[PDB]
Amino acid sequence: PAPATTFAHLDATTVLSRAIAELGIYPAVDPLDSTSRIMDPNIVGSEHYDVARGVQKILQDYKSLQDIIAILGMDELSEEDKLTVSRARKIQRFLSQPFQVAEVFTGHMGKLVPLKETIKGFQQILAGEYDHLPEQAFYMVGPIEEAVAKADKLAEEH
Amino acid sequence: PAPATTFAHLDATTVLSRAIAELGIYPAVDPLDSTSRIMDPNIVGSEHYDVARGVQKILQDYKSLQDIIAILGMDELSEEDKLTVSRARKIQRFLSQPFQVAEVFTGHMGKLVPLKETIKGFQQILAGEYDHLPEQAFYMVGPIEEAVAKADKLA
Amino acid sequence: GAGSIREAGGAFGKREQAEEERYFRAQSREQLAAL
Amino acid sequence: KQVAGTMKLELAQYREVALLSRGVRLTELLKQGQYSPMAIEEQVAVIYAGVRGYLDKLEPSKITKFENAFLSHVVSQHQALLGTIRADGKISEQSDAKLKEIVTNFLAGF
Amino acid sequence: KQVAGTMKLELAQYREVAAFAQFGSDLDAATQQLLSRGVRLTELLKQGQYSPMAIEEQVAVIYAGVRGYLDKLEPSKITKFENAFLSHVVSQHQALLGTIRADGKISEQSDAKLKEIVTNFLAGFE
Amino acid sequence: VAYWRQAGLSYIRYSQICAKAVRDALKTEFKANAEKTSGSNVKIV
Amino acid sequence: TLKDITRRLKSIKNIQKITKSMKMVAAAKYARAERELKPARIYGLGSLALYEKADIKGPEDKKKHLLIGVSSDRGLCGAIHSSIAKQMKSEVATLTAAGKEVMLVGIGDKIRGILYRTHSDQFLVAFKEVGRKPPTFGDASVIALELLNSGYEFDEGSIIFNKFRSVISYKTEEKPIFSLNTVASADSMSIYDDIDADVLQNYQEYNLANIIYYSLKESTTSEQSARMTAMDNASKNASEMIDKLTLTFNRTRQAVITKELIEIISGAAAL
Amino acid sequence: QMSFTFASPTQVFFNGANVRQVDVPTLTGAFGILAAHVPTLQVLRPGLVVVHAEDGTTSKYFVSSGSIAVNADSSVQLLAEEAVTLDMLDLGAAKANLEKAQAELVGTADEATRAEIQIRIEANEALVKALE
């Protein structure tokens, strides 16, 4: 009753999920459970709204495909399903961000990513511009340039 | 609240289970819910301790597999998983025993198994020395020699 | 109830996670050597 | 911290797919007896031996006993390195190489 | 009534066979057609906030959806069609809209006019 | 001993070439189904 | 706990839906496999009519053996791959106990994955991507080339496949594969005119391809039937677990409502 | 007396049929098989298979390769990897591919690659001669 009663008193609720914190992703924000009252294309713009809705849709489709993965395994999906799963995992990693106040926990350095940098990065991961980069390059970085640089360094060392 | 409060007053707990009793295994002791404070290598010996801990390990592994075994059948496991299942089922059977107070309504004469014979039989089952006998041969016997006799009597 | 097999954390969610991680670590090794 | 950050990362990666042999090595290395609290230097030496690859040449079953023997050896003829780790708090690259060669020799003899 | 009876039956069949999706490419033509018509109608029921439609425009859109003039189209395009088509029928076909709204039903003349409008628009649609 | 066997080939390769040649000469009404039905998909490890 | 039971209910309901869809898909694929098995069976059994009319008997003392096992890359079938692996292991044992040098071939990733831990010294080549698309004669031709372009001059061979009997029944069969020296040295072949070693070589190569094709077309049908029945059984078991867990869930929710009422009533009675 | 089974990996043309004569293009020449023909076993080359029914009518096919077995019980087994009725082929594609194969032959300098080019050439030559 206490959180359920608090929900109606807010304008932008951010819900932290333990299942996402167990994936190593931080902040543990639940992308399919957090809501804003200004997530309106007449307030933030059509590009930002479309990118956010596409991210949420691909994450919901990933949730749906995880069951078929559980029963059948990952080697039985249509190539478009594998593409959906790959892009969804990349979007999950890229949603994580290293915090300045978490340098003691993470070890990484903090990042403060502007709005248009975020929109551009997620728009490009949605369009498929990084289907060649590994998913572990988007984890715990800032903008998409850091993702490309981390992928380069990973390729060099590994 | 009553059994939960009683749990703290005991040195040994034998927890009987209805699910185990419906499998025909008697006594219905739950082997992963019964504890003792002298189950300690420095008290019962490293041999006893190792046999007990290995039995409990294989039973826990069987219990972990039970879900996949229930839905996807037995054939969707690996080779070591099937070996674990078979040994765990043999151990489940061999944990049962005919009592002398139960002779009246079972006909089977009761068995009083010495501790060393128990440790030896379970060490041997854990080793694999009886992976060729059927699991029904370990059900309601005393020592492991009665298990091999019952196996030779089935075939 | 989409994604409820993995969400229950049973013997089927653990094997689902293992399958995803195996497949995508193989794919990451395949994608890093070609970079 | 040096040994345990890497051990935590590798144990997480092992839990994700439960590499796998290093993960099993670390798991069987986390097991401990009762009423036997180890010193922090001996803990660091054991986690070093387990996280640097000196335990993947052994089967998971024997790991435990190796540890015992290892500790014995280290607490018999190598009190200097343990005292060094204890006083400095960190490992130095010199002492890193020292414990490296100690564990390499012991694994060769084990 | 005319359009929604058919739409409801088709969506019920689609809900019956929806669990077979993500494998539907390996099933018979009847199941694949149920799945396709269902995805088209599901994309037809999406709507934007604070923009309610008149009943005759809803009737035109559902008519296009259930009579089969969207099966050849891609799902991701359906919305776009439903938008463009709407603007079209609002500008150059206000007479048929007024007729459907004033008579409350799709007469046979109105049915033929709807059929012609939708087939010509789809012929000239991108 | 034909010329291709002297060159080291086999009758499996001979058959493959001959069947592919017979398929290439099919009028396109049958060609797609013909190349689908007889196409190989197995890969060697 | 109510939330644990609800989690498990949702999980097993998803599993039941997926296994039902997989049973339908396996039925659709088995229909096509059993349709294509008729001309493939006529073909593959007419390829063997010679060795049954000429009564080729193979050698009893020859040394090298080639053992082929036909399976697929997909699981969830049942005892398909396990039957093939059991037959292959039994035959390898019985041959090596007679001194014969045995080399293994596995068509399909499952048989190689099963046998590669214990039988890997005795291994020649394996094949992947068997099961997704139905087998074609191009697949048999490729397998026959890589069995010929391998330098392993075998003396005798066997091929172990799952012969399809019915929707419920399949039997692990074994077919022999003769060398040039076996069909050339046979006394029953003296009645076949216009024959030299070259035509017999070509004939034996083509018949290798034919027997591989016939084995693939039998095994695909057997495997699709087995997968259909296995997914049917999985759906049955999932429905059983769903019913038991629904009973448990209703029990637990009634208990939770009663407990909350009792808490409220005892709080009100203490005033 | 002749029981003739003619089959492709995906299609059966005859199955125990009673034909009276079959002409086959074996790699050691063409020959015609009637009942009681001497037992033989051969492998085929690309060419026409003309099956003669008991009632004078003939069926022409084009087979790419495969095997032929005439047995002591007058049972004939013809197994073609690619058997095709003559109405499914066109002359123009056969001629164009023959020209391409001749060009690639006059270009190639290897021995086994040249063997494969020659096989394709002779296959397309049989196609051209058979179509018209």
Curated annotation (Swiss-Prot), chain A:
Superkingdom, natural source: Eukaryota
Subcellular location field: Mitochondrion inner membrane
Keyword Lipid metabolism attached: no
Iron keyword on record: no
Phosphoserine modification, residue list: S46, S64
Modified residues (N6-succinyllysine): K153
Main localization (coarse): mitochondrion
Family from the record: Belongs to the ATPase alpha/beta chains family.
Record text on subunit structure and interactions: Homotrimer. Component of the ATP synthase complex composed at least of ATP5F1A/subunit alpha, ATP5F1B/subunit beta, ATP5MC1/subunit c (homooctomer), MT-ATP6/subunit a, MT-ATP8/subunit 8, ATP5ME/subunit e, ATP5MF/subunit f, ATP5MG/subunit g, ATP5MK/subunit k, ATP5MJ/subunit j, ATP5F1C/subunit gamma, ATP5F1D/subunit delta, ATP5F1E/subunit epsilon, ATP5PF/subunit F6, ATP5PB/subunit b, ATP5PD/subunit d, ATP5PO/subunit OSCP.
Name of the protein described by the UniProt record: ATP synthase F(1) complex subunit beta, mitochondrial
Organism of derivation: Homo sapiens (Human)
Residues of the full protein shown: 370 to 527 of 529
UniProtKB/Swiss-Prot annotation, chain E:
N6-succinyllysine PTM sites in chain numbering: K1, K72, K80, K105, K113
Entry binding sites for ATP: Q47, Q49
Expression by tissue: Fetal lung, heart, liver, gut and kidney. Expressed at higher levels in the fetal brain, retina and spinal cord.
Domain of life: Eukaryota
Localization, UniProt: Mitochondrion; Mitochondrion inner membrane; Cell membrane
Description of post-translational modifications: The N-terminus is blocked.
Modified residues annotated as N6-acetyllysine in this record: K1, K8, K72, K80, K105, K113, K115
Protein's job: Subunit alpha, of the mitochondrial membrane ATP synthase complex (F(1)F(0) ATP synthase or Complex V) that produces ATP from ADP in the presence of a proton gradient across the membrane which is generated by electron transport complexes of the respiratory chain. ATP synthase complex consist of a soluble F(1) head domain - the catalytic core - and a membrane F(1) domain - the membrane proton channel. These two domains are linked by a central stalk rotating inside the F(1) region and a stationary peripheral stalk.
Subunit note: Homotrimer. Component of the ATP synthase complex composed at least of ATP5F1A/subunit alpha, ATP5F1B/subunit beta, ATP5MC1/subunit c (homooctomer), MT-ATP6/subunit a, MT-ATP8/subunit 8, ATP5ME/subunit e, ATP5MF/subunit f, ATP5MG/subunit g, ATP5MK/subunit k, ATP5MJ/subunit j, ATP5F1C/subunit gamma, ATP5F1D/subunit delta, ATP5F1E/subunit epsilon, ATP5PF/subunit F6, ATP5PB/subunit b, ATP5PD/subunit d, ATP5PO/subunit OSCP.
First and last residues shown, out of full length: 427 to 552 of 553
Curated annotation (Swiss-Prot), chain F:
Primary location class: mitochondrion
Superkingdom of origin organism: Eukaryota
GO biological process annotation, one example: proton motive force-driven mitochondrial ATP synthesis
N6-succinyllysine: residues bearing it: K20, K31, K36
Signal peptide coordinates: none
Entry's localization field: Mitochondrion; Mitochondrion inner membrane
MF GO annotations: hydrolase activity; proton-transporting ATP synthase activity, rotational mechanism
GO cellular component, one term: mitochondrial matrix
N6-acetyllysine found at: K20, K31, K36, K43
Keywords: Acetylation, ATP synthesis, CF(1), Disease variant, Hydrogen ion transport, Hydrolase, Ion transport, Membrane, Mitochondrion, Mitochondrion inner membrane, Primary mitochondrial disease, Transport
Result, substituting Y11C: In MC5DN3; likely pathogenic
Expression by tissue: Ubiquitous.
Quaternary structure and partners: Component of the ATP synthase complex composed at least of ATP5F1A/subunit alpha, ATP5F1B/subunit beta, ATP5MC1/subunit c (homooctomer), MT-ATP6/subunit a, MT-ATP8/subunit 8, ATP5ME/subunit e, ATP5MF/subunit f, ATP5MG/subunit g, ATP5MK/subunit k, ATP5MJ/subunit j, ATP5F1C/subunit gamma, ATP5F1D/subunit delta, ATP5F1E/subunit epsilon, ATP5PF/subunit F6, ATP5PB/subunit b, ATP5PD/subunit d, ATP5PO/subunit OSCP.
Disease entry from the Swiss-Prot or TrEMBL record: Mitochondrial complex V deficiency, nuclear type 3: A mitochondrial disorder with heterogeneous clinical manifestations including dysmorphic features, psychomotor retardation, hypotonia, growth retardation, cardiomyopathy, enlarged liver, hypoplastic kidneys and elevated lactate levels in urine, plasma and cerebrospinal fluid.
Originating species: Homo sapiens
UniProtKB/Swiss-Prot annotation, chain G:
Alphabetical UniProt keywords: Acetylation, ATP synthesis, CF(1), Hydrogen ion transport, Ion transport, Membrane, Mitochondrion, Mitochondrion inner membrane, Phosphoprotein, Transit peptide, Transport
One of the Pfam families matching this protein, by short name: ATP-synt
Listed transmembrane segments: none
Record-listed Phosphoserine modification sites: S120
Positions of post-translational N6-acetyllysine modification: K13, K29, K89, K128, K171
Membrane topology: Peripheral membrane protein
GO cellular component terms, semicolon-separated: membrane; mitochondrial inner membrane; mitochondrial matrix; mitochondrion; proton-transporting ATP synthase complex
Biological process per Gene Ontology, one example term: ATP biosynthetic process
Places the protein is found: Mitochondrion inner membrane
Tissue localization of expression: Isoform Heart is expressed specifically in the heart and skeletal muscle, which require rapid energy supply. Isoform Liver is expressed in the brain, liver and kidney. Isoform Heart and Isoform Liver are expressed in the skin, intestine, stomach and aorta.
InterPro entries reported in the protein's UniProt record: ATP_synth_F1_ATPase_gsu, ATP_synth_F1_gsu, ATP_synth_F1_gsu_CS
Listed GO MF terms: proton-transporting ATP synthase activity, rotational mechanism; RNA binding
In-chain residues carrying the UniProt-annotated modification N6-succinyllysine: K23, K89, K128, K244
Cited NCBIfam families: ATPsyn_F1gamma (TIGR01146)
PANTHER family: ATP SYNTHASE GAMMA CHAIN, ATP SYNTHASE SUBUNIT GAMMA, MITOCHONDRIAL
Homology family: Belongs to the ATPase gamma chain family.
Name recorded for this polypeptide: ATP synthase F(1) complex subunit gamma, mitochondrial
Native organism: Homo sapiens
